[PDB]
């Protein structure tokens, strides 16, 4: 069988997809676990993520298709189908609606400003990744939850083990052991004095309301502290890099600040954030997909990066047109597991571009472009460093 993931470097979209779009659904072999079909068409990836005939749970003895040694199993939102998924997620729901998240815009700019003060203080050329991409989204969610600043490094280390393809079940055991004790302390302390942060709301939901159990309370906090900043950090650098590599660099968004939200959406469609793939889904009944009968139990991988370049949904899909304003990308997913932080991420990315254009309109790469240190063979695509000058 065709091997997957496919060869690519940086944010390169590999040409093999232009072949597969014209072809029927094709089966592939993965680094670990069972084989799977590759959903790449826009409508198919949508069906995998939102049709109730595709379950995220391997309830038929499947060995999960994956790029990581130890399979991704736990008690959080990615381990559940509706309605069970829907009940647990509703514990967090109200805190991530657009109405709640628009309120954080001011603070997001505050932290973004503080990061750039430090970056500018360090002198040109400086590493945008270390000075902004990493600290800002980390600070945002950690202070949403109630995690103090000097412990941020701990949650970065835990998050990277989850996302590293060389993680064994043993490392995941270690992470789990270390994360449970740390959150174990915050629980005791919030039981000994309430606080108006988000982990404190989880403690009320477990202890006062009986809505959730202790391990569910822990799981939800793990989900948000694992999925909640590393992806944004990668995108801040990926987006800036895409923009700085063009002749006009940031000038168009300097000239037309009102077009920043669209640029954020276009970049979300264009950037192949993933080197691997997310969770496979499993057909719960026989069904037809791009000329193939997918049988009950068989796995299908939703390749978000290919959906976002469907040749019939997006004309000239390889072109980054910040005015494209195309049909809705699947970059935050779709259906039940559609990113709970989608708006927070849009807010974070919009503000970063506001602050960078208003402050460094002549931003530019600080090293030659071909010297850039793209991460090789990682789960997410991105940069080890992003030197910038101004
Ligand atoms: C650019 C930044 C981000 C991107 C590209 C992104 C993308 C995604 C995607 C595509 C999914 C669905 C994956 C699948 O269904 O297989 C997802 C799920 C999730 N994301 Fe995000 N996300 C981003 C930022 C965030 C932020 C800021 C948060 C903060 C809460 C977050 C928390 C989550 C959680 C908890 C889930 C699982 C939800 C569920 O299973 O119900 N992500 N993300
Ligand atoms: C740019 C967007 C990214 C996105 C960003 C973060 C998510 C990752 C982290 C989310 C949750 C999390 O760790 N919770 C702790 C429970 C343990 C449980 N046990 C596992 O082993 C496990 C995983 O490995 C999960 C991997 C998630 C892949 C997700 C990524 C897919 C892309 C679309 C579990 O869910």
Q: Contact, 205 vs 91, CB < 8 A?
A: yes
C-alpha distances in Å from residue 300, one per residue of 9, 66, 284, 287: 24, 11, 11, 12
Residue 85 annotated as lining a ligand binding site = yes
> Nearest 10 degrees: CA dihedral of 378, 38, 63, 77?
70
Q: Is the CB of 300 under 6 A from ligand 1?
A: no
Residue 179 Cα to ligand 1 middle (Å)? 20
- Residues 72 and 78: their CA atoms lie apart, in Å, by 9
Structural domains for the chain? 2-389 (1.10.630.10)
Nearest to 17 by CA among 9, 29, 7, 32: 7
Q: Is the CB of 162 under 6 A from ligand 1?
A: no
- Residues 132 and 139: their CA atoms lie apart, in Å, by 10
β-pair partners for 380: 274
Q: Is the CB of 339 under 6 A from ligand 1?
A: yes
Q: Which ligand 2 atom sits closest to the C-alpha of 176? A: 17
Q: Which ligand 2 atom sits closest to the C-alpha of 68? A: 24
* Tokens found for residue 301: 């991988």
Query: Radius of gyration over alpha carbons of the chain, in Å?
Result: 21
Method used to obtain the model: X-ray
Whole-angstrom distance between the N-terminal and C-terminal Cα of the chain? Answer: 49
Degrees to nearest 5, angle at CA 59 with 57 and 61 = 120
Residue 305 Cα to ligand 1 middle (Å)? 15
């Amino acid at each position: 069988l065709l091997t997957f993931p496919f060869a690519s470097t940086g944010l390169e979209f590999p040409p093999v997809y232009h072949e597969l779009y014209q072809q029927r659904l094709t089966k592939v072999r993965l680094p670990y676990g069972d084989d799977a079909y590759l959903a790449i068409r826009y409508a198919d990836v949508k069906t995998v993520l939102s049709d109730s005939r595709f379950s995220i749970v391997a309830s038929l003895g499947q060995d999960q298709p994956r790029t990581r040694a130890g399979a991704r199993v736990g008690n959080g939102l990615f381990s559940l189908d509706p309605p069970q998924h829907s009940r647990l997620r509703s514990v967090l729901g109200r805190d991530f609606t657009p109405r709640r998240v628009e309120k954080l815009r001011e603070r997001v700019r505050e932290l973004t400003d503080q990061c750039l003060d430090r970056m500018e203080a360090a002198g040109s050329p400086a590493d945008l990744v270390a000075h902004l991409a990493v600290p800002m989204p980390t600070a945002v969610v950690c202070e949403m939850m109630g995690v103090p600043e000097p412990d941020h490094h701990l949650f970065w280390g835990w998050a990277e083990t989850i996302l590293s393809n060389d993680t064994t079940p043993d490392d995941l055991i270690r992470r789990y052991q270390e994360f449970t004790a740390y959150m174990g302390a915050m629980v005791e302390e919030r039981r000994a004095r309430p606080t108006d942060d988000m982990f404190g709301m989880l403690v009320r939901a477990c202890d006062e309301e009986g809505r959730i159990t202790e391990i569910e309370m822990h799981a939800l906090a793990s989900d948000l502290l694992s999925a909640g900043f590393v992806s944004t950090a990668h995108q801040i650098a990926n987006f800036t890099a895409m923009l700085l590599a063009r002749p006009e660099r940031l000038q168009p968004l300097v000239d037309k600040p009102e077009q920043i939200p669209a640029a954020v959406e276009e970049l979300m469609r264009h950037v192949p954030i993933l080197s691997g793939f997310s969770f496979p889904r499993y057909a719960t009944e026989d069904l037809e997909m791009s000329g193939v009968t997918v049988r009950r139990g068989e796995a299908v991988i939703p390749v978000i990066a290919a959906a976002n370049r469907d040749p019939d949904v997006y004309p000239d899909a390889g072109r980054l047109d910040l005015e494209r304003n195309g049909l809705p990308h699947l970059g935050f997913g779709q259906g039940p597991h559609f990113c709970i932080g989608a708006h927070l991420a849009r807010v974070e990315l919009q503000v970063v571009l506001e602050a960078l254009t208003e402050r460094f309109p002549d931003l530019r790469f600080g090293i030659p472009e071909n010297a850039l240190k793209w991460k090789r063979g990682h789960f997410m695509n991105g940069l080890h460093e992003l030197p910038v000058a101004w």
